[PDB]
């Protein structure tokens, strides 16, 4: 009932579950909607792309070829606190799809990226 492995099937289930939580989210939903659209197909094309990102990260295969940091830099600014929401929802989704062992491998990878995005996107300083 829970994946003890990482494959196209498990990642596709992860994308389904996570981006449905994101779409329904009070804080994240508008950001994503303003960026990709509201149609089911636009959301399917986004899940496909992020699915390819994760396959490249986790399986070493797929057609993801974009610049993830640049993309988030180019987004209209949003609060740093949203990274907490994103991670909470992602961990919930992983907990549905994967056993504890696999879940923790992928969460760790997401945490590392989120931490890198945050150090790059917010000074936390002043100027
Ligand atoms: C506050 C948290 C985050 C928000 C609000 C957010 C938002 C978005 C949005 C709106 C897009 C669509 C970009 C567009 O169509 O212009 C996007 C793309 C993407 N996101 Fe995020 N993101 C967040 C965190 C993350 C994290 C932590 C990761 C990785 C672990 C990630 C991975 C990606 C990737 C790979 C893309 C595709 C970029 C491309 O088109 O090449 N995001 N994100
Ligand atoms: C970005 N999800």
Short mmCIF file of N, CA, C and O and ligand atoms in Angstrom, two decimals:
data_model
loop_
_atom_site.label_atom_id
_atom_site.label_comp_id
_atom_site.label_asym_id
_atom_site.label_seq_id
_atom_site.Cartn_x
_atom_site.Cartn_y
_atom_site.Cartn_z
N UNK A 1 0.83 -1.24 0.00
CA UNK A 1 0.00 0.00 0.00
C UNK A 1 0.86 1.28 0.00
O UNK A 1 0.43 2.32 -0.52
N UNK A 2 2.06 1.19 0.59
CA UNK A 2 3.03 2.29 0.54
C UNK A 2 4.30 1.87 -0.19
O UNK A 2 4.79 0.76 0.01
N UNK A 3 4.83 2.76 -1.02
CA UNK A 3 6.02 2.47 -1.81
C UNK A 3 7.27 2.37 -0.97
O UNK A 3 7.60 3.27 -0.19
N UNK A 4 7.97 1.25 -1.14
CA UNK A 4 9.25 1.01 -0.49
C UNK A 4 10.37 1.27 -1.50
O UNK A 4 11.53 0.99 -1.25
N UNK A 5 9.99 1.81 -2.66
CA UNK A 5 10.94 2.12 -3.72
C UNK A 5 10.62 3.48 -4.36
O UNK A 5 9.59 4.09 -4.04
N UNK A 6 11.51 3.98 -5.22
CA UNK A 6 11.29 5.22 -5.96
C UNK A 6 11.29 4.94 -7.46
O UNK A 6 12.28 4.46 -8.00
N UNK A 7 10.18 5.23 -8.11
CA UNK A 7 10.01 5.00 -9.54
C UNK A 7 9.06 6.02 -10.12
O UNK A 7 8.50 6.82 -9.40
N UNK A 8 8.88 5.97 -11.44
CA UNK A 8 7.94 6.86 -12.10
C UNK A 8 6.54 6.83 -11.46
O UNK A 8 5.90 7.87 -11.33
N UNK A 9 6.09 5.65 -11.04
CA UNK A 9 4.75 5.49 -10.47
C UNK A 9 4.59 6.22 -9.14
O UNK A 9 3.62 6.97 -8.96
N UNK A 10 5.53 6.01 -8.23
CA UNK A 10 5.52 6.64 -6.90
C UNK A 10 5.67 8.16 -6.98
O UNK A 10 5.00 8.88 -6.23
N UNK A 11 6.53 8.64 -7.87
CA UNK A 11 6.72 10.09 -8.08
C UNK A 11 5.46 10.74 -8.67
O UNK A 11 5.12 11.86 -8.29
N UNK A 12 4.80 10.04 -9.59
CA UNK A 12 3.55 10.51 -10.19
C UNK A 12 2.44 10.62 -9.13
O UNK A 12 1.67 11.57 -9.13
N UNK A 13 2.39 9.64 -8.22
CA UNK A 13 1.44 9.69 -7.10
C UNK A 13 1.78 10.85 -6.16
O UNK A 13 0.88 11.56 -5.69
N UNK A 14 3.07 11.05 -5.91
CA UNK A 14 3.52 12.18 -5.10
C UNK A 14 3.09 13.51 -5.71
O UNK A 14 2.55 14.36 -5.00
N UNK A 15 3.32 13.67 -7.01
CA UNK A 15 2.94 14.90 -7.72
C UNK A 15 1.43 15.15 -7.66
O UNK A 15 1.00 16.27 -7.47
N UNK A 16 0.64 14.09 -7.82
CA UNK A 16 -0.82 14.20 -7.75
C UNK A 16 -1.24 14.75 -6.42
O UNK A 16 -1.95 15.75 -6.36
N UNK A 17 -0.80 14.08 -5.37
CA UNK A 17 -1.16 14.40 -4.00
C UNK A 17 -0.65 15.78 -3.56
O UNK A 17 -1.43 16.58 -3.01
N UNK A 18 0.62 16.07 -3.83
CA UNK A 18 1.20 17.34 -3.38
C UNK A 18 0.58 18.54 -4.09
O UNK A 18 0.19 19.51 -3.44
N UNK A 19 0.48 18.49 -5.41
CA UNK A 19 -0.01 19.67 -6.13
C UNK A 19 -1.51 19.90 -6.00
O UNK A 19 -2.00 21.01 -6.19
N UNK A 20 -2.24 18.84 -5.64
CA UNK A 20 -3.63 18.99 -5.22
C UNK A 20 -3.74 19.71 -3.85
O UNK A 20 -4.59 20.59 -3.69
N UNK A 21 -2.89 19.35 -2.89
CA UNK A 21 -2.78 20.15 -1.64
C UNK A 21 -2.34 21.60 -1.90
O UNK A 21 -2.89 22.52 -1.30
N UNK A 22 -1.35 21.79 -2.77
CA UNK A 22 -0.88 23.13 -3.09
C UNK A 22 -1.98 23.99 -3.73
O UNK A 22 -2.16 25.15 -3.38
N UNK A 23 -2.69 23.40 -4.69
CA UNK A 23 -3.77 24.07 -5.41
C UNK A 23 -4.89 24.49 -4.45
O UNK A 23 -5.45 25.57 -4.58
N UNK A 24 -5.17 23.64 -3.46
CA UNK A 24 -6.20 23.90 -2.46
C UNK A 24 -5.73 24.83 -1.35
O UNK A 24 -6.55 25.35 -0.59
N UNK A 25 -4.41 25.05 -1.27
CA UNK A 25 -3.85 25.85 -0.19
C UNK A 25 -4.19 27.34 -0.31
O UNK A 25 -4.06 27.93 -1.38
N UNK A 26 -4.60 27.92 0.81
CA UNK A 26 -5.01 29.31 0.90
C UNK A 26 -3.88 30.28 0.53
O UNK A 26 -4.12 31.31 -0.12
N UNK A 27 -2.66 29.93 0.92
CA UNK A 27 -1.50 30.78 0.69
C UNK A 27 -0.78 30.48 -0.63
O UNK A 27 -0.44 31.40 -1.38
N UNK A 28 -0.54 29.20 -0.91
CA UNK A 28 0.19 28.81 -2.11
C UNK A 28 -0.66 28.89 -3.37
O UNK A 28 -0.19 29.33 -4.41
N UNK A 29 -1.92 28.47 -3.27
CA UNK A 29 -2.82 28.38 -4.43
C UNK A 29 -2.78 29.54 -5.41
O UNK A 29 -2.58 29.32 -6.61
N UNK A 30 -2.98 30.79 -4.92
CA UNK A 30 -2.89 32.00 -5.74
C UNK A 30 -1.57 32.18 -6.47
O UNK A 30 -1.57 32.53 -7.64
N UNK A 31 -0.45 31.95 -5.79
CA UNK A 31 0.87 32.05 -6.42
C UNK A 31 0.96 31.13 -7.64
O UNK A 31 1.37 31.56 -8.72
N UNK A 32 0.58 29.88 -7.45
CA UNK A 32 0.68 28.88 -8.50
C UNK A 32 -0.32 29.18 -9.60
O UNK A 32 0.02 29.14 -10.78
N UNK A 33 -1.56 29.49 -9.22
CA UNK A 33 -2.60 29.88 -10.19
C UNK A 33 -2.22 31.08 -11.04
O UNK A 33 -2.38 31.04 -12.26
N UNK A 34 -1.71 32.13 -10.42
CA UNK A 34 -1.25 33.30 -11.18
C UNK A 34 -0.10 32.98 -12.14
O UNK A 34 0.05 33.64 -13.18
N UNK A 35 0.69 31.95 -11.82
CA UNK A 35 1.87 31.60 -12.62
C UNK A 35 1.60 30.59 -13.75
O UNK A 35 2.10 30.75 -14.86
N UNK A 36 0.83 29.54 -13.47
CA UNK A 36 0.66 28.48 -14.45
C UNK A 36 -0.74 28.43 -15.07
O UNK A 36 -0.91 27.85 -16.15
N UNK A 37 -1.72 29.05 -14.41
CA UNK A 37 -3.12 29.03 -14.85
C UNK A 37 -4.01 28.21 -13.93
O UNK A 37 -3.53 27.66 -12.93
N UNK A 38 -5.29 28.11 -14.27
CA UNK A 38 -6.23 27.34 -13.44
C UNK A 38 -6.78 26.08 -14.09
O UNK A 38 -7.41 25.26 -13.42
N UNK A 39 -6.54 25.91 -15.39
CA UNK A 39 -7.04 24.73 -16.09
C UNK A 39 -6.37 23.46 -15.58
O UNK A 39 -5.23 23.49 -15.10
N UNK A 40 -7.10 22.35 -15.69
CA UNK A 40 -6.62 21.04 -15.27
C UNK A 40 -5.41 20.60 -16.09
O UNK A 40 -4.53 19.90 -15.58
N UNK A 41 -5.39 21.01 -17.36
CA UNK A 41 -4.30 20.64 -18.26
C UNK A 41 -3.00 21.39 -17.94
O UNK A 41 -1.94 20.77 -17.91
N UNK A 42 -3.10 22.69 -17.68
CA UNK A 42 -1.97 23.49 -17.19
C UNK A 42 -1.37 22.92 -15.91
O UNK A 42 -0.15 22.87 -15.75
N UNK A 43 -2.24 22.45 -15.01
CA UNK A 43 -1.79 21.81 -13.79
C UNK A 43 -1.20 20.42 -14.00
O UNK A 43 -0.29 20.02 -13.27
N UNK A 44 -1.71 19.70 -15.00
CA UNK A 44 -1.15 18.41 -15.41
C UNK A 44 0.23 18.57 -16.05
O UNK A 44 1.09 17.73 -15.85
N UNK A 45 0.40 19.62 -16.85
CA UNK A 45 1.68 19.93 -17.49
C UNK A 45 2.75 20.37 -16.47
O UNK A 45 3.94 20.12 -16.65
N UNK A 46 2.29 21.03 -15.40
CA UNK A 46 3.17 21.44 -14.30
C UNK A 46 3.60 20.22 -13.51
O UNK A 46 4.78 20.07 -13.21
N UNK A 47 2.66 19.34 -13.18
CA UNK A 47 2.98 18.10 -12.46
C UNK A 47 3.93 17.20 -13.24
O UNK A 47 4.82 16.59 -12.66
N UNK A 48 3.72 17.14 -14.56
CA UNK A 48 4.61 16.42 -15.46
C UNK A 48 6.04 16.98 -15.35
O UNK A 48 6.97 16.21 -15.15
N UNK A 49 6.18 18.30 -15.48
CA UNK A 49 7.49 18.96 -15.38
C UNK A 49 8.18 18.71 -14.03
O UNK A 49 9.34 18.30 -14.00
N UNK A 50 7.47 18.96 -12.93
CA UNK A 50 8.03 18.72 -11.60
C UNK A 50 8.34 17.22 -11.41
O UNK A 50 9.34 16.87 -10.78
N UNK A 51 7.49 16.36 -11.98
CA UNK A 51 7.77 14.91 -11.98
C UNK A 51 9.10 14.57 -12.66
O UNK A 51 9.85 13.72 -12.18
N UNK A 52 9.38 15.25 -13.77
CA UNK A 52 10.67 15.12 -14.46
C UNK A 52 11.87 15.69 -13.67
O UNK A 52 12.97 15.15 -13.73
N UNK A 53 11.63 16.80 -12.97
CA UNK A 53 12.63 17.36 -12.07
C UNK A 53 13.05 16.32 -11.04
O UNK A 53 14.23 16.07 -10.84
N UNK A 54 12.05 15.70 -10.41
CA UNK A 54 12.29 14.74 -9.35
C UNK A 54 12.89 13.44 -9.85
O UNK A 54 13.73 12.85 -9.18
N UNK A 55 12.46 12.99 -11.03
CA UNK A 55 13.10 11.84 -11.66
C UNK A 55 14.60 12.10 -11.94
O UNK A 55 15.43 11.22 -11.76
N UNK A 56 14.94 13.31 -12.39
CA UNK A 56 16.34 13.67 -12.66
C UNK A 56 17.16 13.69 -11.38
O UNK A 56 18.30 13.22 -11.35
N UNK A 57 16.54 14.19 -10.31
CA UNK A 57 17.13 14.28 -8.98
C UNK A 57 17.30 12.91 -8.31
O UNK A 57 18.32 12.63 -7.67
N UNK A 58 16.29 12.06 -8.48
CA UNK A 58 16.18 10.82 -7.72
C UNK A 58 16.54 9.60 -8.53
O UNK A 58 17.05 8.64 -7.97
N UNK A 59 16.24 9.62 -9.82
CA UNK A 59 16.47 8.44 -10.67
C UNK A 59 17.56 8.65 -11.72
O UNK A 59 17.98 7.69 -12.34
N UNK A 60 18.00 9.88 -11.93
CA UNK A 60 18.99 10.20 -12.96
C UNK A 60 18.48 10.07 -14.39
O UNK A 60 19.27 9.85 -15.32
N UNK A 61 17.16 10.21 -14.56
CA UNK A 61 16.55 10.18 -15.88
C UNK A 61 15.39 11.18 -16.00
O UNK A 61 14.89 11.68 -15.00
N UNK A 62 14.98 11.47 -17.23
CA UNK A 62 13.89 12.40 -17.49
C UNK A 62 14.33 13.53 -18.38
O UNK A 62 15.51 13.65 -18.72
N UNK A 63 13.39 14.39 -18.75
CA UNK A 63 13.68 15.46 -19.69
C UNK A 63 13.68 16.85 -19.03
O UNK A 63 13.55 17.86 -19.73
N UNK A 64 13.83 16.92 -17.71
CA UNK A 64 13.89 18.24 -17.07
C UNK A 64 15.19 18.94 -17.46
O UNK A 64 16.28 18.39 -17.27
N UNK A 65 15.05 20.16 -17.97
CA UNK A 65 16.17 20.93 -18.50
C UNK A 65 16.15 22.42 -18.09
O UNK A 65 16.93 23.23 -18.62
N UNK A 66 15.30 22.78 -17.15
CA UNK A 66 15.16 24.18 -16.76
C UNK A 66 16.09 24.65 -15.67
O UNK A 66 16.98 23.93 -15.22
N UNK A 67 15.86 25.88 -15.21
CA UNK A 67 16.70 26.54 -14.22
C UNK A 67 15.86 26.85 -12.99
O UNK A 67 15.27 27.92 -12.92
N UNK A 68 15.77 25.90 -12.04
CA UNK A 68 14.81 26.02 -10.94
C UNK A 68 14.99 27.28 -10.09
O UNK A 68 14.03 27.99 -9.88
N UNK A 69 16.21 27.58 -9.64
CA UNK A 69 16.43 28.81 -8.89
C UNK A 69 16.02 30.06 -9.66
O UNK A 69 15.27 30.88 -9.13
N UNK A 70 16.48 30.20 -10.90
CA UNK A 70 16.14 31.38 -11.70
C UNK A 70 14.62 31.58 -11.80
O UNK A 70 14.14 32.68 -11.67
N UNK A 71 13.89 30.48 -12.02
CA UNK A 71 12.43 30.49 -12.07
C UNK A 71 11.76 31.09 -10.83
O UNK A 71 10.83 31.90 -10.96
N UNK A 72 12.22 30.67 -9.65
CA UNK A 72 11.69 31.20 -8.39
C UNK A 72 12.14 32.64 -8.10
O UNK A 72 11.39 33.42 -7.51
N UNK A 73 13.36 32.98 -8.53
CA UNK A 73 13.80 34.37 -8.52
C UNK A 73 12.92 35.25 -9.43
O UNK A 73 12.60 36.40 -9.09
N UNK A 74 12.51 34.72 -10.57
CA UNK A 74 11.73 35.49 -11.52
C UNK A 74 10.23 35.59 -11.20
O UNK A 74 9.49 36.33 -11.85
N UNK A 75 9.79 34.84 -10.19
CA UNK A 75 8.41 34.90 -9.72
C UNK A 75 8.14 36.21 -9.00
O UNK A 75 9.06 36.77 -8.38
N UNK A 76 6.89 36.72 -9.07
CA UNK A 76 6.58 37.86 -8.25
C UNK A 76 6.87 37.47 -6.81
O UNK A 76 6.55 36.34 -6.42
N UNK A 77 7.52 38.36 -6.03
CA UNK A 77 7.93 38.02 -4.66
C UNK A 77 6.79 37.51 -3.79
O UNK A 77 5.64 37.94 -3.94
N UNK A 78 7.13 36.59 -2.90
CA UNK A 78 6.21 36.00 -1.95
C UNK A 78 6.95 35.83 -0.62
O UNK A 78 8.19 35.81 -0.62
N UNK A 79 6.21 35.72 0.51
CA UNK A 79 6.85 35.64 1.82
C UNK A 79 7.70 34.38 2.01
O UNK A 79 7.30 33.29 1.59
N UNK A 80 8.85 34.54 2.65
CA UNK A 80 9.74 33.42 2.96
C UNK A 80 9.02 32.33 3.75
O UNK A 80 9.33 31.15 3.59
N UNK A 81 8.07 32.73 4.59
CA UNK A 81 7.28 31.79 5.40
C UNK A 81 6.54 30.75 4.56
O UNK A 81 6.20 29.67 5.06
N UNK A 82 6.30 31.06 3.29
CA UNK A 82 5.60 30.13 2.41
C UNK A 82 6.39 28.84 2.20
O UNK A 82 5.81 27.80 1.89
N UNK A 83 7.72 28.91 2.41
CA UNK A 83 8.58 27.72 2.27
C UNK A 83 8.27 26.67 3.34
O UNK A 83 8.35 25.47 3.08
N UNK A 84 7.90 27.14 4.54
CA UNK A 84 7.37 26.29 5.62
C UNK A 84 6.08 25.57 5.24
O UNK A 84 5.90 24.40 5.56
N UNK A 85 5.18 26.27 4.56
CA UNK A 85 3.90 25.70 4.14
C UNK A 85 4.17 24.61 3.09
O UNK A 85 3.74 23.46 3.25
N UNK A 86 4.94 24.98 2.06
CA UNK A 86 5.34 24.07 0.97
C UNK A 86 5.92 22.77 1.51
O UNK A 86 5.51 21.68 1.08
N UNK A 87 6.85 22.89 2.45
CA UNK A 87 7.51 21.74 3.09
C UNK A 87 6.58 20.91 3.96
O UNK A 87 6.66 19.69 3.96
N UNK A 88 5.69 21.57 4.70
CA UNK A 88 4.69 20.86 5.50
C UNK A 88 3.80 19.98 4.59
O UNK A 88 3.66 18.78 4.81
N UNK A 89 3.23 20.59 3.55
CA UNK A 89 2.42 19.87 2.57
C UNK A 89 3.18 18.78 1.82
O UNK A 89 2.61 17.72 1.52
N UNK A 90 4.45 19.03 1.49
CA UNK A 90 5.28 18.03 0.80
C UNK A 90 5.53 16.80 1.67
O UNK A 90 5.42 15.67 1.21
N UNK A 91 5.89 17.03 2.93
CA UNK A 91 6.11 15.96 3.90
C UNK A 91 4.82 15.14 4.13
O UNK A 91 4.87 13.91 4.17
N UNK A 92 3.69 15.82 4.28
CA UNK A 92 2.39 15.13 4.37
C UNK A 92 2.17 14.22 3.16
O UNK A 92 1.79 13.05 3.30
N UNK A 93 2.44 14.74 1.97
CA UNK A 93 2.27 13.98 0.73
C UNK A 93 3.21 12.77 0.66
O UNK A 93 2.78 11.67 0.29
N UNK A 94 4.49 12.97 1.01
CA UNK A 94 5.48 11.88 1.08
C UNK A 94 5.05 10.78 2.05
O UNK A 94 5.21 9.59 1.76
N UNK A 95 4.53 11.19 3.20
CA UNK A 95 4.01 10.28 4.23
C UNK A 95 2.85 9.41 3.72
O UNK A 95 2.67 8.29 4.16
N UNK A 96 2.09 9.93 2.76
CA UNK A 96 1.03 9.15 2.13
C UNK A 96 1.61 8.14 1.12
O UNK A 96 1.20 6.98 1.09
N UNK A 97 2.59 8.58 0.33
CA UNK A 97 3.11 7.79 -0.79
C UNK A 97 4.17 6.76 -0.37
O UNK A 97 4.16 5.64 -0.89
N UNK A 98 5.06 7.14 0.55
CA UNK A 98 6.27 6.34 0.84
C UNK A 98 6.31 5.85 2.28
O UNK A 98 5.77 6.51 3.17
N UNK A 99 6.99 4.73 2.52
CA UNK A 99 7.32 4.32 3.88
C UNK A 99 8.30 5.32 4.52
O UNK A 99 8.77 6.25 3.85
N UNK A 100 8.58 5.16 5.81
CA UNK A 100 9.39 6.16 6.53
C UNK A 100 10.79 6.36 5.91
O UNK A 100 11.29 7.49 5.82
N UNK A 101 11.39 5.25 5.47
CA UNK A 101 12.74 5.22 4.93
C UNK A 101 12.89 6.07 3.65
O UNK A 101 13.75 6.93 3.58
N UNK A 102 12.04 5.80 2.66
CA UNK A 102 12.03 6.53 1.40
C UNK A 102 11.60 8.00 1.55
O UNK A 102 12.25 8.90 1.01
N UNK A 103 10.52 8.20 2.30
CA UNK A 103 10.04 9.53 2.66
C UNK A 103 11.17 10.42 3.15
O UNK A 103 11.28 11.57 2.73
N UNK A 104 12.02 9.88 4.03
CA UNK A 104 13.07 10.68 4.65
C UNK A 104 14.22 11.05 3.70
O UNK A 104 14.81 12.10 3.84
N UNK A 105 14.48 10.18 2.73
CA UNK A 105 15.46 10.44 1.66
C UNK A 105 15.03 11.61 0.76
O UNK A 105 15.83 12.50 0.44
N UNK A 106 13.75 11.60 0.37
CA UNK A 106 13.23 12.62 -0.53
C UNK A 106 12.98 13.96 0.18
O UNK A 106 13.25 15.02 -0.37
N UNK A 107 12.46 13.90 1.41
CA UNK A 107 12.27 15.12 2.21
C UNK A 107 13.59 15.87 2.42
O UNK A 107 13.65 17.09 2.30
N UNK A 108 14.63 15.12 2.76
CA UNK A 108 15.98 15.64 2.93
C UNK A 108 16.41 16.39 1.67
O UNK A 108 16.95 17.48 1.75
N UNK A 109 16.14 15.81 0.49
CA UNK A 109 16.50 16.46 -0.77
C UNK A 109 15.74 17.78 -0.96
O UNK A 109 16.34 18.79 -1.33
N UNK A 110 14.44 17.77 -0.68
CA UNK A 110 13.61 18.97 -0.76
C UNK A 110 14.06 20.05 0.23
O UNK A 110 14.02 21.23 -0.11
N UNK A 111 14.42 19.64 1.45
CA UNK A 111 14.87 20.55 2.49
C UNK A 111 16.15 21.27 2.05
O UNK A 111 16.30 22.47 2.22
N UNK A 112 17.07 20.50 1.47
CA UNK A 112 18.32 21.05 0.93
C UNK A 112 18.09 22.09 -0.16
O UNK A 112 18.71 23.15 -0.15
N UNK A 113 17.20 21.80 -1.10
CA UNK A 113 16.85 22.78 -2.13
C UNK A 113 16.15 24.02 -1.56
O UNK A 113 16.50 25.15 -1.93
N UNK A 114 15.19 23.80 -0.67
CA UNK A 114 14.42 24.91 -0.08
C UNK A 114 15.34 25.86 0.69
O UNK A 114 15.22 27.08 0.61
N UNK A 115 16.27 25.26 1.42
CA UNK A 115 17.26 26.01 2.17
C UNK A 115 18.13 26.86 1.23
O UNK A 115 18.37 28.04 1.49
N UNK A 116 18.53 26.29 0.09
CA UNK A 116 19.31 27.00 -0.92
C UNK A 116 18.51 28.13 -1.58
O UNK A 116 19.03 29.25 -1.73
N UNK A 117 17.26 27.85 -1.96
CA UNK A 117 16.37 28.90 -2.46
C UNK A 117 16.25 30.06 -1.47
O UNK A 117 16.31 31.22 -1.86
N UNK A 118 16.06 29.74 -0.19
CA UNK A 118 15.80 30.75 0.83
C UNK A 118 17.01 31.67 1.08
O UNK A 118 16.85 32.89 1.20
N UNK A 119 18.20 31.08 1.12
CA UNK A 119 19.46 31.82 1.26
C UNK A 119 19.72 32.76 0.07
O UNK A 119 20.39 33.80 0.22
N UNK A 120 19.20 32.37 -1.10
CA UNK A 120 19.33 33.12 -2.34
C UNK A 120 18.27 34.20 -2.54
O UNK A 120 18.55 35.23 -3.15
N UNK A 121 17.06 33.97 -2.03
CA UNK A 121 15.89 34.82 -2.31
C UNK A 121 15.61 35.93 -1.30
O UNK A 121 14.94 36.91 -1.63
N UNK A 122 16.10 35.75 -0.08
CA UNK A 122 15.83 36.68 1.03
C UNK A 122 17.10 37.08 1.75
O UNK A 122 17.92 36.22 2.10
N UNK A 123 17.27 38.36 1.94
CA UNK A 123 18.44 38.81 2.65
C UNK A 123 18.21 38.62 4.13
O UNK A 123 19.11 38.18 4.87
N UNK A 124 16.97 38.95 4.56
CA UNK A 124 16.60 38.88 5.99
C UNK A 124 17.20 40.14 6.70
O UNK A 124 16.96 40.37 7.87
N UNK A 125 17.99 40.92 5.92
CA UNK A 125 18.78 42.13 6.30
C UNK A 125 18.03 43.48 6.27
O UNK A 125 17.26 43.75 7.20
N UNK A 126 18.20 44.33 5.24
CA UNK A 126 17.50 45.63 5.17
C UNK A 126 17.75 46.43 3.88
O UNK A 126 16.99 46.34 2.92
N UNK A 127 18.85 47.22 3.84
CA UNK A 127 19.25 48.04 2.70
C UNK A 127 18.28 49.18 2.47
O UNK A 127 18.55 50.09 1.69
C1 LIG B 1 7.42 28.72 -1.14
C2 LIG B 1 7.72 27.61 -1.81
C3 LIG B 1 7.59 27.51 -3.34
C4 LIG B 1 6.75 28.17 -4.15
C5 LIG B 1 5.68 29.23 -3.76
C6 LIG B 1 7.00 27.72 -5.50
C7 LIG B 1 6.33 28.16 -6.62
C8 LIG B 1 6.54 27.76 -7.91
C9 LIG B 1 5.78 28.19 -9.07
C10 LIG B 1 4.61 29.19 -9.00
C11 LIG B 1 6.29 27.59 -10.16
C12 LIG B 1 5.82 27.76 -11.63
C13 LIG B 1 6.82 28.69 -12.32
C14 LIG B 1 6.26 29.33 -13.57
O1 LIG B 1 5.47 28.68 -14.29
O2 LIG B 1 6.63 30.51 -13.84
C15 LIG B 1 7.38 26.75 -9.72
C16 LIG B 1 8.20 25.96 -10.50
C17 LIG B 1 9.12 25.04 -10.04
N1 LIG B 1 9.38 24.69 -8.70
FE1 LIG B 1 8.66 25.75 -7.09
N2 LIG B 1 8.02 26.78 -5.47
C18 LIG B 1 8.39 26.63 -4.14
C19 LIG B 1 9.36 25.78 -3.66
C20 LIG B 1 10.01 24.83 -4.41
C21 LIG B 1 10.95 23.85 -3.90
C22 LIG B 1 11.36 23.74 -2.41
C23 LIG B 1 11.35 23.11 -4.95
C24 LIG B 1 12.36 21.95 -4.96
C25 LIG B 1 12.48 21.10 -3.93
C26 LIG B 1 10.70 23.62 -6.15
C27 LIG B 1 10.85 23.15 -7.45
C28 LIG B 1 10.36 23.71 -8.61
C29 LIG B 1 10.78 23.37 -9.96
C30 LIG B 1 11.84 22.36 -10.41
C31 LIG B 1 9.96 24.26 -10.89
C32 LIG B 1 10.01 24.31 -12.43
C33 LIG B 1 10.88 25.47 -12.89
C34 LIG B 1 10.93 25.39 -14.40
O3 LIG B 1 9.91 25.70 -15.07
O4 LIG B 1 11.99 25.01 -14.94
N3 LIG B 1 9.88 24.65 -5.77
N4 LIG B 1 7.51 26.88 -8.35
C1 LIG B 2 7.23 24.47 -7.00
N1 LIG B 2 6.45 23.67 -6.71
#
